[PDB]
Design a protein around this ligand. Structure first.
Ligand code: BCB
Ligand code: BCB
Ligand code: BCB
Ligand code: BPB
Ligand code: BPB
Ligand code: MQ9
Ligand code: HEC
Ligand code: HEC
Ligand code: HEC
Ligand code: HEC
Ligand code: NS5
Ligand code: LDA
Ligand code: LDA
Ligand code: FE2
Lengths: 332, 258, 273, 323
């Protein structure tokens, strides 16, 4: 089980600290190629005519677009999400205003979510932004999603073995391990940290000596909190295809300033962005999804870092369509 | 308020750091380094002009004597004064104090340099139940060579010069540890046996090769007082003889390798 | 100035190079050609350290740090202040260590004893080369080597380990640690046994070779023997670095992922997946 | 070369020796047998072994501890045998995940862990008695038992005493191959980086030093095996050329030297101090120091470096950062 040299290495800290990325050139190439499948922008169209708010019947989100512009969007959406199924994945082919098929109503929510990420989470996505393709990658079910229990394979386009199946109790420890970069950490950092905003990720004291009043008995956080955070961090690392030193100087994980890279602050915003998407857009979709979509607790599939990043420090190596599709944000 | 905070930015851990160093230096200097001086001290000097008393320092560096009570009777106390009265056939190569000495005679026979032995007791090392510990298999009759290993008895011993020097007639076994320690050989053309420590023997199927000394030099291997016993000092004499060959067997052995 | 038994041993000869020229003692120390070169390199390396440290922000001994170049300099020479001092000190360090090793051979030869100690001492010298020379060469930059600072070299070990997510799962490290632990236990056991035999307490008699064998035969069912425990200790200790060296060299040049995932070779056998 | 220092060229076989103890001679069970290949690099005789009460007690307690662990591990893969064998390293028996303070945790959340720790402790105690007794039975000093006692004390510090001192069973070491390893990182993270704990530094220094010392001592005795340096007891009571030469090798090299007795005291002391330093470090952690790096920063010891990428302010502290 080994990877032949050369390794690609970068430097992310002062010389002599052994901080930076360590990459296997073939793995990077394979990912570059997968991500290179991002369809190009459709040709621009001239904005002629009334807004489709007048033209069409049931346009709630993109009503300000002209007809040519709107149909360009629908064509782009079909290509990103349901290329194999076509327009009828969401539409009644005899009534295009029909909301009868669930992908339609889910897609409307996804236009809102997408415009929200690009408008309200620029702290994270900056001017790269996301499109439907960033998560979906050409299928209606995005390849990397999370339920409220760990599932395997991580990529749901792959067929599970019996042991991988979430019903097979004996495969639990491996389902957990493969979500935490093969560690044995007995914690699921998705449901603990990313599904909602209940839990505090920071566990390290900010004083040298123990403060009287928080340092004894039931006053204390259990040591289990530090395992869980390490588990989250193993997961974040694997999700972006990187290591701790991409973000931290391990001298002091808890410190910022010179002890942290700009990427750590971008990751901080990502945690907040993921929690927002999950609490406010994705988790509620269980009301709208077929039962076949839902997990064993009736949860809709939700997002973690891998959902976008898919093993790369920037999703799709930083590819952008933000200028090509202003409809998708930022929305002034 | 803080657990451990003592005052000024004194805190418990900070004080224990000092205590830790103190404990380590105390044990190292005042205990271990004085245990280190139970042999060989006090240091000696050529022609001490005069010393009406030992330096205070010679008293301070020594531990109190300890006495071992030996398993088969007697005691030994260390440190104790052990001058080496024995005359050494060595001369100063130069007047400088750190100058090497050099053999004025035959260093192997004179037992100087790598051919030195220690003034061990002239007693036969014993087993736990009082028997001679290192004895020939002619005597240690319930001991044997493990099946699979060369029986060297009968084999020629070939010295550094490629010449055969004698014939192995016996092995001496450590009856306390079940471990062979010497071979005994009849020295060709002399009327004597010689022991040779097994560490100086390359044991082959058809010969015992010995590169420490030339065939000629077996003539002068130290002789034991008995034929079936060996004293601690004799073991030192015999072992040291071959070790001396490593530097002295030929003129060129003492000079630079490269 | 001489141990009471020392004079008879202080003869000329035994040198690897130089012969009579440096064949003498200064106090208790043998000199030899390699004592001269050891001193030369120590003196240089220590001068370079002082000069470098003086050019830096601190004189606190915990905080001083002389660091390798940025990665971008590859395997070339760096400016003195930005890695060049470090490069020079590394050369003086290697020079000092190897001289020290060869001086030990000359001392061994003069005494008529085996060369086992200088040989054993090659193992730490080798490990220094793995960290500072071989692994940086394989990765293509001096900048991968560790800095010279009492605490800063710990920060390098820390980040190096965490570059592979959890270094504890590194199979060469598991082996390394295991030898470190057995060796420490074994040294306490060996030292304790010899002391327990020579120092039974009260006015009891010193015990015997047979007692040593009996004690471990009783306690664990096996005694390795008096000569063999010394061979074993040399083996256990040496393999701390000899096995560790594989885990160090593998990380980067032969494995770029976290170490826990490496065990996928086992976990993911399709028979039980 | 001295080939003996590599392996035994000609092995000897002889009648098997027994050194009688003040008690328990009738508790030696087994017939010695001899391994020829073992005999090449060690003594060839394996066995007999002494039984005795403390030894049998140790096995009983130890086995119980092991059964509690293995049963809990089996439950983890839901008693699937093949998955059990597959996943064994990953499986563990854990301390309480929830904060119960010093409350005895539910069986399902730390109760079994506590039970296994108790039996392990009784196991270690019984074995210490065996280690101590056999020395006394054979008329030997108790130096081994006192070295062993420091190791046991360290296990107690990380298993029991530190959790008690901060008041939480949640801090104990899990049983399991990878799980006991994950604890090392979790504990270091919680307490602000164990590299900056001075007693972690002391322990390492003594552990590396044990490596140095046993390589040096082992090699030193092999180098003078031609002079019988291996027979260390009689080299102690009657100095021979073996340890004169050994002492002088070191005096000429480093300028000072030990005796053949005292180098075993240095070794015993270095070994002990690995465990003594580790214990002190654990006893201070959490009790009196919360973040070892910050403690070093407080006392001026920590190094600092320029930023290489831009220094990055905590976003959480920004004006209007969400929570
Ligand atoms: C977060 C990161 C971690 C980490 C990262 C780490 C790395 C990255 C590496 C190790 C390595 C090693 N680690 Mg691990 N580690 C170890 C133990 C060990 C060592 C056995 C092993 C070898 C060390 C070495 O190379 O020395 C080197 C010592 C040398 C080269 C000494 C040279 C001496 C020289 C020849 C002479 C010097 C002379 C002076 C200049 C002269 C002074 C003069 C005065 C005295 C007069 C333990 C016991 C633990 C525990 C219990 O937690 C642990 C945890 C961890 N390690 C963490 C998980 N460790 C190494 C290894 O082998 O990994 C597989 C390694 O590369
Ligand atoms: C891969 C892992 C590595 C590692 C990991 C490590 C850890 C994790 C820790 C140490 C610690 C220590 N290390 Mg580091 N280390 C050190 C030296 C040191 C000491 C500062 C200290 C205690 C060592 C000890 O007692 O060993 C056994 C040797 C003994 C008992 C003989 C005495 C040796 C003497 C104390 C060495 C003194 C060195 C001088 C400060 C160096 C400069 C002197 C020159 C300028 C004259 C050297 C000289 C080297 C070289 C040349 O390779 C080295 C390499 C490495 N160490 C590797 C990079 N080391 C501990 C520490 O406290 O750091 C602050 C500690 O926590
Ligand atoms: C990211 C995490 C880190 C970490 C975290 C860590 C912790 C949390 C602790 C250590 C500790 C220690 N570390 Mg550190 N560490 C060490 C080295 C060391 C050791 C010297 C020392 C452990 C002492 C020991 O021998 O335990 C092995 C010996 C043991 C366990 C004794 C066992 C005795 C017992 C009687 C045996 C009984 C066996 C029975 C058969 C059991 C029966 C089974 C049952 C089920 C019946 C090195 C050399 C390095 C390097 C090179 O980087 C390093 C890095 C780091 N450590 C990282 C900074 N380390 C300890 C310490 O010293 O802290 C102050 C400690 O607690
Ligand atoms: C710095 C110094 C150190 C140091 C020191 C010392 N270390 C000592 C001594 C000294 C001085 C001794 O005197 C004592 C000893 O005696 O040595 C010969 C001992 C020891 N160090 C051991 C292990 C060790 N040291 C470690 C570490 C350090 N040590 C550090 C480094 C580590 C680490 C590194 O993790 C480990 C793992 C053991 C071998 C031994 C204790 C045995 C015990 O306490 O056992 C207790 C007894 C038991 C657990 C019972 C075992 C039952 C088993 C066999 C399972 C049976 C199951 C059954 C078959 C099921 C039946 C089913 C049925 C249906 C059929
Ligand atoms: C696996 C086997 C092991 C093993 C074995 C053996 N070990 C030996 C021998 C054997 C057999 C000897 O024969 C020889 C000796 O004589 O013993 C008394 C020796 C010795 N082991 C020392 C240190 C030691 N062993 C370590 C480890 C192990 N040892 C492992 C465990 C460690 C660590 C860190 O673990 C340390 C620090 C010295 C005391 C001594 C060399 C003196 C020297 O070489 O003199 C010559 C050099 C000098 C006096 C100074 C040189 C200064 C340079 C030029 C400038 C500084 C550069 C430097 C790189 C800066 C680093 C900064 C730092 C904070 C990052
Ligand atoms: C810029 C600058 C600084 C310039 C000048 C540099 C300088 C140092 C100059 C000196 C010039 C001089 C005076 C002379 C030239 C001759 C010369 C080459 C001198 C060398 C000076 C020098 C470099 C000294 C450093 C010595 C050194 C490396 C010491 C380390 C000692 C240490 C820390 C050892 C660690 C191990 C340890 C704890 C050992 C203690 C226990 C001992 C002593 C074990 C050894 C030992 C063992 C292992 C046995 O098994 C044994 C068995 C039976 C009998 C005896 C022994 C025995 O003694
Ligand atoms: C689901 C993933 C869809 C796919 C694939 C396509 N369409 Fe769509 N379309 C979808 C939604 C959610 C909406 C409403 C947009 C809003 O702002 O609320 C629509 C709307 C249209 C309309 C307007 C119909 C009307 O309301 O009068 C048209 C004309 C339309 N869509 C066309 C269309 C075509 C031709 C497609 C394939 C090229 C296509 N859509 C795919 C969701 C989805
Ligand atoms: C990741 C942050 C996403 C972005 C950006 C977009 N989508 Fe999405 N979508 C995502 C998830 C986690 C899910 C839930 C799981 C599921 O497949 O239901 C979805 C689902 C949909 C669906 C329904 C798919 C189905 O159940 O058949 C549709 C039709 C859909 N998404 C459309 C869509 C569009 C049009 C987007 C860009 C405007 C878009 N999604 C972005 C995650 C993410
Ligand atoms: C950036 C993409 C990161 C990588 C890779 C790793 N970490 Fe991280 N870590 C990051 C952030 C943004 C945060 C703070 C989260 C918040 O909500 O505030 C953290 C935090 C930690 C902590 C806790 C620090 C504290 O103040 O208590 C630890 C101990 C930590 N991280 C460890 C760690 C390790 C060991 C990693 C590699 C396995 C790792 N992190 C990677 C961002 C990033
Ligand atoms: C899609 C909706 C995403 C999810 C979910 C997460 N991230 Fe992200 N991230 C996303 C984009 C579009 C970009 C590129 C922005 C840009 O600056 O070009 C990023 C970028 C990062 C980075 C910056 C990497 C770098 O500067 O080299 C980091 C460190 C990062 N993202 C971390 C991160 C984490 C840890 C997440 C889960 C909590 C996470 N992201 C989710 C899009 C999306
Ligand atoms: C005050 C109160 C109420 C109680 C306090 C009680 C007390 C003293 C508690 C102490 C707790 C302690 C000492 C906990 C210690 C935990 C520690 C140090 C654990 C460390 C590591 C454990 C590990 C590595 C062990 C894992 C276990 C295994 C893999 C199982 C072993 C099983 C075998 C190999 C089977 C062998 C037989 C087979 C081949 C047939
Ligand atoms: C850890 C608690 C002790 C459990 C009981 C262990 C059995 C004790 C056996 C005592 C044997 C006494 N003897 C023979 C040495 O005197
Ligand atoms: C970090 C652990 C440090 C342990 C202390 C090292 C002991 C070295 C002892 C050498 C002292 C020599 N002398 C001659 C001055 O006594
Ligand atoms: Fe010894």
């Amino acid at each position: 089980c080994f990877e032949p040299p050369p390794a690609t290495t970068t430097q992310t800290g002062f010389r002599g600290l052994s901080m930076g990325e360590v990459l296997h050139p073939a793995t990077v190439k394979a990912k570059k190629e997968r991500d290179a499948q991002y369809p190009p922008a459709l040709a621009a169209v001239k904005a002629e005519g009334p807004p489709v708010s007048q033209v069409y019947k049931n346009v709630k989100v993109l009503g300000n677009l002209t007809e040519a512009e709107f149909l360009r969007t629908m064509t782009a959406i079909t290509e990103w999400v349901s290329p194999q199924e076509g327009c009828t994945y969401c539409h009644d082919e005899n009534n295009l205003a029909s909301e009868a098929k669930y992908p339609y109503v889910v897609a409307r929510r996804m236009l809102e979510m997408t415009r929200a990420i690009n408008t309200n989470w620029t702290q994270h996505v900056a001017q790269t932004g996301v499109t439907c393709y960033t998560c979906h990658r050409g299928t209606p079910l995005p390849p990397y999603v999370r339920y409220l229990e760990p599932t395997l394979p991580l990529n749901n386009r792959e067929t599970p073995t019996h042991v991988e199946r979430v019903e097979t109790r004996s495969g639990y420890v491996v389902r957990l391990a493969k979500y935490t970069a093969y560690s044995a950490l007995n914690y699921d950092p998705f449901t603990m940290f990313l599904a909602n905003d209940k839990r505090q990720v920071r566990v390290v004291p900010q004083t040298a000596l123990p403060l009287v009043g928080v340092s004894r008995g039931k006053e204390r956080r259990p040591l289990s909190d530090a395992y869980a955070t390490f588990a989250l961090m193993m997961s974040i690392s694997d999700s972006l295809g990187t290591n701790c030193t991409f973000c931290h100087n391990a001298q002091t994980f808890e410190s910022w300033g010179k002890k942290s890279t700009p990427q750590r602050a971008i990751a901080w915003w990502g945690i907040r962005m993921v929690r927002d998407l999950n609490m406010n857009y994705l988790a509620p979709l269980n009301a709208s999804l077929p039962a076949s979509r839902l997990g064993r607790q009736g949860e809709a599939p939700q997002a973690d870092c891998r959902t976008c990043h898919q093993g790369v420090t920037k999703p799709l190596f930083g590819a952008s369509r933000l200028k090509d599709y202003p409809e998708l944000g930022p929305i002034k | 308020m803080y657990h451990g905070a003592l005052a000024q930015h004194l805190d418990i851990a900070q004080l224990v750091w000092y205590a830790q160093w103190l404990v380590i230096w105390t044990v190292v200097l005042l205990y271990l380094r004085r245990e280190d001086r139970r042999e060989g001290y006090p240091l000696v000097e050529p022609l001490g002009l005069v010393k009406l008393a030992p330096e205070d320092g010679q008293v301070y560096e020594l531990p109190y004597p300890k006495t071992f009570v030996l398993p088969h009777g007697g005691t030994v106390t260390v440190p104790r004064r052990r001058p080496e009265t024995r005359e050494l056939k060595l001369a100063q190569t130069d007047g400088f104090e750190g100058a090497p000495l050099q053999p004025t005679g035959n260093p192997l026979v004179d037992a100087v340099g790598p051919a030195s032995y220690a003034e061990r007791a002239e007693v036969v090392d014993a087993t736990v139940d009082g028997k001679a510990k290192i004895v020939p298999l002619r005597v240690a009759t319930d001991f044997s060579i493990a099946e699979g290993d060369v029986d060297p008895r009968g084999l020629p011993v070939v010295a550094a010069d490629g010449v055969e020097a004698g014939t192995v007639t016996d092995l001496w076994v450590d009856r306390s540890e079940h471990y062979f320690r010497y071979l005994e050989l009849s020295v060709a053309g002399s009327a004597r046996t010689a022991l040779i420590p097994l560490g100086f023997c390359d044991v082959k199927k058809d010969k015992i090769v010995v590169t420490s000394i030339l065939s000629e030099q077996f003539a002068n291997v130290p002789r034991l007082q008995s034929r079936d016993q060996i004293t601690l000092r004799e073991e030192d004499k015999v072992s040291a003889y071959y070790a001396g060959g490593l530097l002295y067997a030929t003129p060129e052995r003492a000079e630079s390798l490269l | 100035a001489l141990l009471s038994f020392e004079r008879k041993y202080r003869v000329r000869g035994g040198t690897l190079i130089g012969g009579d020229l440096f064949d003498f003692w200064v106090g208790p120390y043998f000199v030899g050609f390699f004592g001269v070169s050891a001193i030369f390199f120590i003196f240089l390396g220590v001068s370079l350290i002082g000069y470098a440290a003086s050019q830096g922000p601190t004189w606190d001994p915990f905080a001083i740090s002389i660091n390798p170049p940025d990665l971008k300099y590859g395997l070339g020479a760096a400016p003195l202040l930005e890695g060049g001092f470090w490069q020079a000190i590394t050369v003086c360090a290697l020079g000092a260590f190897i001289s020290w090793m060869l001086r030990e051979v000359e001392i061994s030869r003069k005494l008529g004893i085996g060369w086992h100690v200088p040989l054993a001492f090659c193992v730490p010298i080798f490990m220094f080369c793995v960290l500072q020379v071989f692994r940086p060469l394989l990765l293509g930059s001096w900048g991968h080597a560790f800095p010279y600072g009492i605490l800063s070299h710990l920060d390098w070990v820390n980040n190096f380990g965490y570059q592979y997510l959890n270094w504890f799962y590194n199979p060469g490290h598991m082996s390394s640690v295991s030898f470190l632990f057995v060796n420490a236990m074994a040294l306490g056991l060996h030292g304790g046994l010899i002391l327990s035999v020579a120092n039974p307490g009260d006015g009891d008699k010193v015990k015997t070779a047979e007692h040593e064998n009996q004690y471990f035969r009783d306690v664990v069912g096996y005694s390795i023997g008096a000569l063999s425990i010394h061979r074993l200790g040399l083996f256990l200790a040496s393999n701390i670095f000899l096995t560790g060296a594989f885990g160090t060299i593998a990380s980067g040049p032969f494995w770029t992922r976290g170490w826990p995932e490496w065990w996928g070779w086992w976990l993911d056998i399709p028979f039980w997946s | 070369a001295d080939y003996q220092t590599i392996y035994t060229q000609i092995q000897a076989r002889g009648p098997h020796i027994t050194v009688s103890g003040e008690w328990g001679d009738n508790d030696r069970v087994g017939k010695p047998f001899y391994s020829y290949w073992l005999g090449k690099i060690g003594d060839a005789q394996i066995g007999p072994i002494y039984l005795g009460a403390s030894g049998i007690a140790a096995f009983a307690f130890g086995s119980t501890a092991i059964l509690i662990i293995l049963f809990n591990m089996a439950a983890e893969v839901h008693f699937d045998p093949l998955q059990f064998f597959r996943q064994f390293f990953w499986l563990g028996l854990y301390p309480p995940k929830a904060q119960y303070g010093m409350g005895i945790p539910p069986l399902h959340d730390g109760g079994w862990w506590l039970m296994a720790g108790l039996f392990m402790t009784l196991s270690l105690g019984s074995w210490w008695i065996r280690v101590y007794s056999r020395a006394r039975a054979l008329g030997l000093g108790t130096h081994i038992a006192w070295n062993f006692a420091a190791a046991i004390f360290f296990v107690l510090c990380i298993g029991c005493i530190h959790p008690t001192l901060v008041g939480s069973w949640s801090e104990g070491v899990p049983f399991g191959i990878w799980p006991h390893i994950d604890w090392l990182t979790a504990f270091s993270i919680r307490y602000g980086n164990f590299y900056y704990c001075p007693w972690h530094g002391f322990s390492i220094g003594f552990a590396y030093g044990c490596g140095l010392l046993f390589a040096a001592h082992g090699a030193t005795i092999l180098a003078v095996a031609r002079f019988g340096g291996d027979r260390e007891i009689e080299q102690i009571t009657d100095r021979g050329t073996a340890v004169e030469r050994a002492a002088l090798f070191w005096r000429w090299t480093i300028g000072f030297n030990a005796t053949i007795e005292s180098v075993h005291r240095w070794g015993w002391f270095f070994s002990l101090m690995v465990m003594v330093s580790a214990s002190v470090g654990i006893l201070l952690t959490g009790t009196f120091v919360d973040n070892w790096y910050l403690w070093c920063v407080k006392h001026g010891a920590a190094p600092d470096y320029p930023a290489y990428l831009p220094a990055t302010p905590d976003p959480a502290s920004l004006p209007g950062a969400p929570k």
